[PDB]
Amino acid sequence: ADPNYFIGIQFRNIPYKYDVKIPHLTFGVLHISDNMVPDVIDILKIMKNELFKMDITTSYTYMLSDGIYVANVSGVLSTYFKIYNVFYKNQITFGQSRMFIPHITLSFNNMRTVRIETTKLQIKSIYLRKIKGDTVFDMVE
Numbered sequence: 001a002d003p004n005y006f007i008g009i010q011f012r013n014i015p016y017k018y019d020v021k022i023p024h025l026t027f028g029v030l031h032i033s034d035n036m037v038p039d040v041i042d043i044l045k046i047m048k049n050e051l052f053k054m055d056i057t058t059s060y061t062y063m064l065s066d067g068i069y070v071a072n073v074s075g076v077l078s079t080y081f082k083i084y085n086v087f088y089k090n091q092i093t094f095g096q097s098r099m100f101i102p103h104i105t106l107s108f109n110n111m112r113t114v115r116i117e118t119t120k121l122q123i124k125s126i127y128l129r130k131i132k133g134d135t136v137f138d139m140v141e
């Protein structure tokens with residue numbers, strides 16, 4: 001019953017240098033059977049307006065753990081609560097193991113904090129992907 005799917009968000013802009021291929025926010029983590037993907041997609045579609053209304057911002061980078069350098073993310077709390085609650089009610093396992101500490105990993109290196117003026121991260125797309133697997137759904141505004 002290990003986490004096996006993520007809901008990710010990719011962005012039009014990232015105001016920091018980074019070494020990862022494509023920076024993303026892991027917004028949510030799921031444990032599901034593959035045949036539940038349509039149901040998860042249905043919920044993502046129902047919540048599409050709400051998700052794309054999020055005002056995601058960033059203002060500094062930091063070390064989250066040894067060798068994990070990340071950008072902070074703000075603006076996703078209330079929407080996280082809503083989607084958490086919808087999945088919970090629907091008996092779809094979501095956010096049962098993942099700490100809520102929104103961040104975007106930038107590099108696997110020990111690096112100093114950079115601070116910028118608060119910057120909005122424009123959402124490029126929101127997707128559902130198998131952990132260490134393929135993206136099975138992607139939506140744009």
Ligand SMILES: [K+]
Pocket residue numbers: none
């Ligand atoms: K807990």
